[PDB]
Amino acid sequence: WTVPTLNPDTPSPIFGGSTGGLLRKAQTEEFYVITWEAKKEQIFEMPTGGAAIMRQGPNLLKFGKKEQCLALTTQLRNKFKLTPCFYRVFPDGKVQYLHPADGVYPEKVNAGRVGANQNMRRIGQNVNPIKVKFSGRMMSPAE
Amino acid sequence: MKDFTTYLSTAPVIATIWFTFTAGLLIEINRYFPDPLVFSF
Amino acid sequence: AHIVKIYDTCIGCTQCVRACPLDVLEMVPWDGCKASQMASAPRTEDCVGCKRCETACPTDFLSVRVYLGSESTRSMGLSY
Amino acid sequence: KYGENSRYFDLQDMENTTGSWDMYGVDEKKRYPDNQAKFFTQATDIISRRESLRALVALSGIAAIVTYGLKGAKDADLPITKGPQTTGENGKGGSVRSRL
Amino acid sequence: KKAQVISPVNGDPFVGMLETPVTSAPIVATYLSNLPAYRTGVAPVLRGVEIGLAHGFLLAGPFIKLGPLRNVPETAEIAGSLSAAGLVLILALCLSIYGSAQFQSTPSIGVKTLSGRSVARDPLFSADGWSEFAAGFLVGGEAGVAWAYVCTQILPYYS
Amino acid sequence: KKVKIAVDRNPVETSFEKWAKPGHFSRTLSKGPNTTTWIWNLHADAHDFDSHTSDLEEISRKVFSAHFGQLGIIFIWLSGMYFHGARFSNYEAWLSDPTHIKPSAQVVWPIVGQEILNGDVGGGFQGIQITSGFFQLWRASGITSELQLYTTAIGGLVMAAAMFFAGWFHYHKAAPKLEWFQNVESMLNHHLGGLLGLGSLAWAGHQIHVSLPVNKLLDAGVDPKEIPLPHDLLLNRAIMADLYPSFAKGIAPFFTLNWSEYSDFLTFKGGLNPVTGGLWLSDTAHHHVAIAVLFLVAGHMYRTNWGIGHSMKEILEAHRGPFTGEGHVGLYEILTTSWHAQLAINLALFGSLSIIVAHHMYAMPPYPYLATDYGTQLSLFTHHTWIGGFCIVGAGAHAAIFMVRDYDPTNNYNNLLDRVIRHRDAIISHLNWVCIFLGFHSFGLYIHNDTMSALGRPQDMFSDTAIQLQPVFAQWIQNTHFLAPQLTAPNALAATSLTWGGDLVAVGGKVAMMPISLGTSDFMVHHIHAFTIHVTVLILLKGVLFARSSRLIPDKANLGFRFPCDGPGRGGTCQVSAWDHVFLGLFWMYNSLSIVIFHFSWKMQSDVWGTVTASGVSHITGGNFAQSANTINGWLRDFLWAQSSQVIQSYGSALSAYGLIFLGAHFVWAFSLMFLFSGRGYWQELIESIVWAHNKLKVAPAIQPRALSITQGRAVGVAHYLLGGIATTWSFFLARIISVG
Amino acid sequence: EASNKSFPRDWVKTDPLVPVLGFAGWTIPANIGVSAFGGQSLFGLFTQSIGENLAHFPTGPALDDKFWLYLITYHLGLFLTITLGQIGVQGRKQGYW
Numbered sequence A: 001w002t003v004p005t006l007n008p009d010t011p012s013p014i015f016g017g018s019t020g021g022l023l024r025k026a027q028t029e030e031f032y033v034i035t036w037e038a039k040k041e042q043i044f045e046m047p048t049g050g051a052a053i054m055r056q057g058p059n060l061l062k063f064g065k066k067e068q069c070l071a072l073t074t075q076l077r078n079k080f081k082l083t084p085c086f087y088r089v090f091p092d093g094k095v096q097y098l099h100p101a102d103g104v105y106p107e108k109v110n111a112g113r114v115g116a117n118q119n120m121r122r123i124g125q126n127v128n129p130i131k132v133k134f135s136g137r138m139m140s141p142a143e
Numbered sequence B: 001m002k003d004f005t006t007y008l009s010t011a012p013v014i015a016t017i018w019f020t021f022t023a024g025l026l027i028e029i030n031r032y033f034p035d036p037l038v039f040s041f
Numbered sequence C: 001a002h003i004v005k006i007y008d009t010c011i012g013c014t015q016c017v018r019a020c021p022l023d024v025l026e027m028v029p030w031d032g033c034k035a036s037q038m039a040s041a042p043r044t045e046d047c048v049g050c051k052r053c054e055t056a057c058p059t060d061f062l063s064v065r066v067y068l069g070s071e072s073t074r075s076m077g078l079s080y
Numbered sequence D: 001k002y003g004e005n006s007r008y009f010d011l012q013d014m015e016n017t018t019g020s021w022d023m024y025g026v027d028e029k030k031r032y033p034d035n036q037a038k039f040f041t042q043a044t045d046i047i048s049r050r051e052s053l054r055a056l057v058a059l060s061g062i063a064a065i066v067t068y069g070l071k072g073a074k075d076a077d078l079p080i081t082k083g084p085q086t087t088g089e090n091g092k093g094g095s096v097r098s099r100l
Numbered sequence E: 001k002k003a004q005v006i007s008p009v010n011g012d013p014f015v016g017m018l019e020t021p022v023t024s025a026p027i028v029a030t031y032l033s034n035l036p037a038y039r040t041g042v043a044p045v046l047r048g049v050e051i052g053l054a055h056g057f058l059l060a061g062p063f064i065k066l067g068p069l070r071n072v073p074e075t076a077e078i079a080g081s082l083s084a085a086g087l088v089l090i091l092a093l094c095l096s097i098y099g100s101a102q103f104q105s106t107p108s109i110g111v112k113t114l115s116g117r118s119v120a121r122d123p124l125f126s127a128d129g130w131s132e133f134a135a136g137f138l139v140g141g142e143a144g145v146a147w148a149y150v151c152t153q154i155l156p157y158y159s
Numbered sequence F: 001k002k003v004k005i006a007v008d009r010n011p012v013e014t015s016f017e018k019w020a021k022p023g024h025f026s027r028t029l030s031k032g033p034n035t036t037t038w039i040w041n042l043h044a045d046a047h048d049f050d051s052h053t054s055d056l057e058e059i060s061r062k063v064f065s066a067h068f069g070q071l072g073i074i075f076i077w078l079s080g081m082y083f084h085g086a087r088f089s090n091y092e093a094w095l096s097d098p099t100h101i102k103p104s105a106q107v108v109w110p111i112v113g114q115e116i117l118n119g120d121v122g123g124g125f126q127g128i129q130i131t132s133g134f135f136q137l138w139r140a141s142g143i144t145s146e147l148q149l150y151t152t153a154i155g156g157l158v159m160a161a162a163m164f165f166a167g168w169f170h171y172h173k174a175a176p177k178l179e180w181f182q183n184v185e186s187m188l189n190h191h192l193g194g195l196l197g198l199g200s201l202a203w204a205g206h207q208i209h210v211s212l213p214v215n216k217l218l219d220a221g222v223d224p225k226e227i228p229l230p231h232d233l234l235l236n237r238a239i240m241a242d243l244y245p246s247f248a249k250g251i252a253p254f255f256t257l258n259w260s261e262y263s264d265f266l267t268f269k270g271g272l273n274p275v276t277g278g279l280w281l282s283d284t285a286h287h288h289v290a291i292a293v294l295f296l297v298a299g300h301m302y303r304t305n306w307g308i309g310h311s312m313k314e315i316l317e318a319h320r321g322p323f324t325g326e327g328h329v330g331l332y333e334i335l336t337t338s339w340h341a342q343l344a345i346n347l348a349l350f351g352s353l354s355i356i357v358a359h360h361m362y363a364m365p366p367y368p369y370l371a372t373d374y375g376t377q378l379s380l381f382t383h384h385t386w387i388g389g390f391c392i393v394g395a396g397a398h399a400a401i402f403m404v405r406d407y408d409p410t411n412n413y414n415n416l417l418d419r420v421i422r423h424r425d426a427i428i429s430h431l432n433w434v435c436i437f438l439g440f441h442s443f444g445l446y447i448h449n450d451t452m453s454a455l456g457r458p459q460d461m462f463s464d465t466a467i468q469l470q471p472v473f474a475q476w477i478q479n480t481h482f483l484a485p486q487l488t489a490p491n492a493l494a495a496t497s498l499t500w501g502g503d504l505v506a507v508g509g510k511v512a513m514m515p516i517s518l519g520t521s522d523f524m525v526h527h528i529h530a531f532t533i534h535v536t537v538l539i540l541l542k543g544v545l546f547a548r549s550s551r552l553i554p555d556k557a558n559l560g561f562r563f564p565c566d567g568p569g570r571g572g573t574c575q576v577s578a579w580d581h582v583f584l585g586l587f588w589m590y591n592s593l594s595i596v597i598f599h600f601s602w603k604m605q606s607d608v609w610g611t612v613t614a615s616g617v618s619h620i621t622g623g624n625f626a627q628s629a630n631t632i633n634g635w636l637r638d639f640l641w642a643q644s645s646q647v648i649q650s651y652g653s654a655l656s657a658y659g660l661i662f663l664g665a666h667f668v669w670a671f672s673l674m675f676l677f678s679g680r681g682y683w684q685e686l687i688e689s690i691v692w693a694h695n696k697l698k699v700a701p702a703i704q705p706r707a708l709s710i711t712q713g714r715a716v717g718v719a720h721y722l723l724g725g726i727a728t729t730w731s732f733f734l735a736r737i738i739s740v741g
Numbered sequence G: 001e002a003s004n005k006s007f008p009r010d011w012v013k014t015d016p017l018v019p020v021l022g023f024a025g026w027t028i029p030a031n032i033g034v035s036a037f038g039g040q041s042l043f044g045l046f047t048q049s050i051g052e053n054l055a056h057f058p059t060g061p062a063l064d065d066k067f068w069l070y071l072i073t074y075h076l077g078l079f080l081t082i083t084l085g086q087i088g089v090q091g092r093k094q095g096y097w
């Protein structure tokens, strides 16, 4: 498995428009694109409010927040058993593959992802804040 | 009627019965011994 | 960003990763000196701080801990 | 392109993609009479910089408040500038103790 | 049962504005396009002058007819015009400091016109453009307040 | 056929074994308590029948039988009121002298000195002066005896037993199937034609035959013991013909369409009876006949089992336009499949109806000697206004519950609901703007006037003297309704109300109703009302439209309708739930209706209510609403502080209970602030430090003490807030108006 | 909305016959004299009041003028007739029945 490049020629679900879609944030800093392949034309709920019809085959959707994309991801996986992957798109044109970063979904293991932010102590084994006092920035003993 | 008497032994029913009893006892004490400001009898 | 630490009481139940609405956590093999899996937090720059992960952690005390740090556009969950 | 067959995402058109549109702007150069435009480009020539405009605003506002307190409030015939015109509530301190 | 009116914005159902009669009726679009705010090729100082004339002329009325000296015959108009001059001055100050605060990041994405052709950014939305716009607003607003007084004095049917 | 009786036979065994197992209805509560949160959840989930099961049949059966229980309880309550009027009343004394005797139907036992509440109400009677209007209602029905009230009480108890039997029967013995509940066409046909049509027709008949003659003799000075009993009027047509000559002709003028012959007892007089200050019962009888015919024709509108009628699905699916897409497509399924949608609509209209009732019963007093019983009038207005506000907030709540639970995007594609959710941002933005605009241009007017009056500039206020904000539209409508019998309602003899204009009706020296003049203060307070209403709508509609998702939380429907938060993240998501939007809409409904009823009380006591001592009306407060209601300090001084002199000086009187409840409602209100201003995390730690002391002495309970949930903390807080505020206003109003009126 | 890519400019499908026909369907019945108006008509009395209030042009009508009743009723019926005519015409041309 390798990082898939976002195909921009992907169609979009049938949606009549809303007011919960993109804002100036998409034009300024970043927005999000979620893609999935549907087996049949089905009506799903938009996280922005409203009902859209996903097309048979590949479907592309734009969102201004990662939580929107993962809400739709969990809806498509739990109510439709699809396998969506979403990206972070910048106004520069730079696309950053995000969700199945390893290819598999993070609730399952893929044998090759490296563990991060794992404290190898108990949560009651943290030092007192008097030990991390004057650490430059204001810090928690968990570091 | 084992289940009915189990229902009557529930916390709200027992509380209602016990507090009706306590309030009635206090009310009858205050009817027959009215205005007890001090222990003098 | 918010600080999401994971401690060595993790039992690999994967419920923290299932419950994260931002894909901040994942399950890594054999970093904890434990059974098969241990939880990780490689994407804490996307963490909003909902603490849905540590609402779903069954260990006592929590094996996943979210310490609310400095706010950003992603941490504050802004579509604008 | 971007409108072809419900393809609302284009990497070569990020303006249409993100909704970066001028919904009502028109770039026509011709609006005003050129003598009027000259008059008003020259009237603002001195204050067309931030520092100059804030200097004008400071000068005008400070002068205005100072002349309003010195002269303008009395010209407006404000009650605070006329005075009580009466003995006031002087000897009526309280209902019980009529204090000065 | 054809002919629906409300459409997504520029046909994009995921941007979220929902073009609508109040938004995109040709009379409304025309009127809003002809306003000096949306004359993106015209110099910001002159658009500011027009906007300021309009606003200084309009916001004198309330101060004249509803102010604290509204019941004094010849003093109502003077006091209201001066209150409006002060408010215009404050607004020019606010415009200046807005131009100082806002225009530092220089956005990089381009603009289009709901038709496909990319246009240049409004010079108004720069430091120099907004500074000259605020200068024009001050000049035009004080001029419009003075003209509001002049109209109090010369209009036949002014009450 | 499609519309038929369909029931399951003996679906549920009548047994006490589930009484002995608390929490049987839930799978999460059947496991027994380990914490006290279980004890609270057992009561929060008791009537959430759609969370017990998920099939609509058992839900609907539970709902039907619970409605039967509610009706049985209402019947117990009505029979109790009639019985207390038959046994513990001064009603027979009040009939003979209703202008001097205070209605009382509750006697207090002399136990702890509380026999002081048994006040001198009149009629050789000692009791609590009631404010329910039951005496006037009974006199309108033509009771004239305690025996009739006693037998009405017995009938009410019989009907309550019938209702409880019917609930048991329609749940346990023969419970209707789902297809029986989904016959909304037949339900509407029967509820319009039968419940409202036959009901109004039967009441019209009672009024033709019992109320009108009895009250015509009562208004003629006849003592109630000399009046013929209703059955003597039913049997003897000669007595009725002596009272109303049209009865000599029989029912022939009805079938010959010579209906004008019945103009003796079917009138269009309008206005008020000058003897009683209430509506003409002939007008009322004609009214009920008319609306009976109207509802009986309305109940023949929907298609049930024969070809004639309408399919509501067709009406809906045909009503669509260029702006609304598919239109009302998919709403028939919503309203035949979701109980919460029906409850939303029905509570909305029922509360609006209760408020309309409040506004229409004070202006057109329908009962004799009701308008001059100022306490009854004020209490009825206040009561029905409050009930309406509560019902409306519940409509918001259950619309949100529908949106969370029963909403399906498959059945709603490009229909009105989808299109409302799709531009909710515009709706709520414009509602927010109008709320802010109204708040400014309503309350800032009061602030401007307070500032000007404090600064010594009354000529700069928004008053009827300085800067008049005259409600000219309402004044025009007043003048138009006043002049209606002249041009636009020529067969009416007088206007519907005296509030439009004209002369006053004085009954017993007191003003029954008199023209209400609208001025600048009325403008300001009506815009205050509009403001508070718009903000309540804002909160509740925002909870409805943002119940499933938001820009903050896109998966809010999965968290549920009733959840505390999502977390301290995204800056903090406290009270994003729709339940919390109901929780806040309750505060704002309270703040709205408090001003509504304050406006009513002050306007009535200043410009309507009062005495006619000489030729000239002396109002209660003296007509100070016009000049003092311009400021907040006027409402504080001339209404709250002034009119509190009767509730705080009531100690040692029969109104001392009102002062006691005033203070106690203040206490409860402030006590609500411990639950509203605080959070669960302090109280759980305090509870565990107390549980330490219980464990030390071996009295630590097995049901672990928990703090109230966040949602329950908020619910307790708002409940105590509403109770305290409303009971404070209740005591203040009643102690004031029983004394001064 | 698979259609409606550009907010069609002819959002109101204008028929110039619609305003004329609504005006004539309302004002002609509104020119029928009836018993309640004293033999006069609603449009007749409305125009009579328009004349009586144009006789002092600056001074607007009073609250007790009866010009407002005629105004509001006439325009209720007229706006209703015009909008229902537009709706009916554009439903006849389109589907909707």
Ligand code: CLA
Pocket (backbone or CB within 6 Å): B026, B029, B030, B034, B035, B036, B037, B038, F112, F113
């Ligand atoms: C904590 C504060 C407080 C205190 C100390 C009191 C104290 C008192 N109140 Mg006040 N009161 C309070 C709060 C308080 N009250 C509140 C909040 C309210 C409003 C609800 C009232 C309202 C109120 C009223 C309206 C009245 C009182 C009265 C009284 C007196 C009651 C005397 C009595 O009943 O003798 C009872 C005597 C006993 C001996 C009973 C003791 C209990 C048992 C029976 C003893 C055990 C015997 C034996 C072992 C039992 C064997 C087993 C049994 C099952 C057979 C007393 C001075 C009354 C009074 O006269 O005051 C002057 C009165 O009329 N109070």
Ligand code: CLA
Pocket (backbone or CB within 6 Å): F012, F013, F014, F015, F016, F018, F019, F024, F025, F061, F062, F063, F065, F066, F068, F069, F073, F164, F165, F166, F167, F168, F171, F172
């Ligand atoms: C003695 C007769 C009887 C018996 C044995 C049962 C037995 C049963 N019923 Mg049935 N039922 C009956 C009468 C009876 N019912 C009647 C008369 C009605 C009509 C209202 C119903 C309506 C009904 C429904 C709709 C449901 C049941 C259910 C049940 C089951 C458990 C109910 C439970 O937990 O009870 C304990 C509950 C109570 C004791 C609560 C009673 C509340 C009453 C009705 C209202 C009182 C309000 C009160 C005045 C408020 C005062 C406030 C206070 C502050 C003063 C069980 C099979 C439920 C079930 O799941 O069955 C499978 C169910 O959903 N029943």
Ligand code: CLA
Pocket (backbone or CB within 6 Å): F063, F064, F067, F068, F071, F180, F181, F183, F184, F186, F187, F190, F191, F193, F194, F195
């Ligand atoms: C003329 C026929 C008729 C009448 C009078 C009613 C009347 C009523 N229905 Mg409706 N209903 C009808 C036909 C009718 N229904 C049909 C055909 C259906 C099937 C589609 C339904 C389905 C239905 C549901 C699903 C519900 C009601 C409810 C109600 C009650 C609402 C509360 C109210 O207004 O209190 C007014 C109270 C009174 C007027 C008191 C008198 C009550 C009398 C005794 C009952 C009415 C006669 C009854 C319908 C016929 C059977 C008689 C019985 C002896 C067998 C009300 C009593 C609601 C309710 O509260 O349920 C209990 C409810 O949830 N009904």
Ligand code: CLA
Pocket (backbone or CB within 6 Å): F201, F202, F203, F204, F205, F206, F208, F209, F233, F234, F235, F236, F237, F240, F246, F247, F248, F249, F250, F251, F254, F262, F289
């Ligand atoms: C539901 C409403 C209602 C009811 C019940 C009545 C009832 C009555 N009206 Mg009233 N009335 C009403 C509405 C009503 N009215 C309205 C709305 C108006 C205005 C138009 C009037 C105007 C009006 C006038 C002007 C008069 C009446 C009269 C009457 C009486 C004569 C009935 C009659 O001749 O009709 C005929 C009715 C029937 C034939 C039905 C009787 C059927 C019986 C009950 C069958 C039962 C037999 C059973 C199966 C076997 C025996 C049982 C057992 C012994 C074995 C009767 C008491 C007249 C009168 O004398 O009043 C004192 C009269 O002059 N009414």
Ligand code: CLA
Pocket (backbone or CB within 6 Å): F043, F044, F045, F046, F047, F048, F049, F343, F347, F390, F391, F392, F393, F394, F395, F397, F398, F401, F561, F562, F579, F582, F583, F719, F723
């Ligand atoms: C026709 C009226 C009606 C009906 C049938 C329902 C029915 C329902 N509502 Mg709705 N609701 C209504 C009116 C109605 N409500 C109104 C008017 C409001 C605004 C206040 C609400 C607000 C509301 C909310 C906010 C919620 C519901 C919920 C529910 C469901 C469960 C309620 C429950 O288990 O409570 C059982 C009963 C109790 C817990 C008792 C409450 C006692 C109150 C708080 C105290 C007041 C008592 C008294 C008046 C004060 C004096 C008492 C004295 C002792 C001091 C159920 C479907 C809940 C739901 O569906 O959850 C998903 C939910 O979250 N409703």
Ligand SMILES: CC1=C(/C=C/C(C)=C/C=C/C(C)=C/C=C/C=C(C)/C=C/C=C(C)/C=C/C2=C(C)CCCC2(C)C)C(C)(C)CCC1
Pocket (backbone or CB within 6 Å): F078, F151, F152, F153, F154, F155, F156, F157, F159, F198, F199, F201, F202
């Ligand atoms: C108050 C009360 C009470 C009582 C009540 C009552 C007493 C009621 C009654 C009721 C009634 C008593 C009713 C009746 C009814 C009747 C009717 C409703 C009738 C009808 C008729 C008709 C509709 C007709 C038709 C027709 C004609 C017209 C002619 C011929 C043909 C025909 C038949 C078709 C009680 C106790 C419960 C308690 C609670 C409260």
Ligand SMILES: CC1=C(C/C=C(\C)CCC[C@H](C)CCC[C@H](C)CCCC(C)C)C(=O)c2ccccc2C1=O
Pocket (backbone or CB within 6 Å): F674, F675, F676, F678, F679, F680, F683, F684, F706, F707, F708, F709, F710, F712, F713, F714
């Ligand atoms: C005071 C308070 C508490 C503490 C309140 C406690 C836990 C509830 C107390 C209810 C009663 C007193 C306990 C019931 C015990 C028995 C049922 C009573 C029977 C015996 C009696 C005679 C004593 C909270 O848990 C809380 C949570 C969230 C926001 C605000 C608050 C809050 O303000």
Ligand code: SF4
Pocket (backbone or CB within 6 Å): C006, C009, C010, C011, C012, C013, C014, C015, C016, C017, C038, C039, C053, C056, C057, C058, C059, C063, C064
């Ligand atoms: S952190 Fe907690 S929830 Fe997540 S895998 Fe480890 S034990 Fe399970």
